[PDB]
């Protein structure tokens, strides 16, 4: 006879359980990364803002020099 049957040793394994691998970093790591990014941004902003203030002072004194003729 010929029918639809499983083999002698059966079929392979079949999963039925929830699989969540829990990928990622701990909270301390991401918080430290954020704090370091904030500090780097603050330092770069302080340097560029001081330079921009000096440039603005230079332009203002240029206007001071040009004022009496106008």
């Amino acid at each position: 006879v010929k029918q639809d049957m499983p083999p002698v040793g059966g079929y392979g394994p079949i999963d039925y359980k929830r699989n969540l691998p829990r990928r990622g970093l701990s909270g301390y790591s991401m918080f430290a990364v954020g704090i370091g990014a904030l500090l780097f941004g603050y330092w770069s902003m302080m340097r560029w803002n001081r330079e921009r203030r000096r440039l603005q002072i230079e332009d203002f004194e240029a206007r001071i020099a040009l004022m009496p003729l106008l």
């Binding site: 639809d4 049957m5 499983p6 079929y11 079949i14 039925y16 359980k17 929830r18």
Partner: protein
Amino acid sequence: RKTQPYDVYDQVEFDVPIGSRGDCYDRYLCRVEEMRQSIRIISQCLNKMPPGEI
């Protein structure tokens, strides 16, 4: 399928999910767990099919 079983449901092994709060979240989780147990019963039925007539 566990309390008043029929034809060959007493020959398979599966779990029954149980909620705790009665909300929609617990019942959605129960449905997902029922999908998992249905996969388990499907595997058990695939590995235990007997020959004969229909």
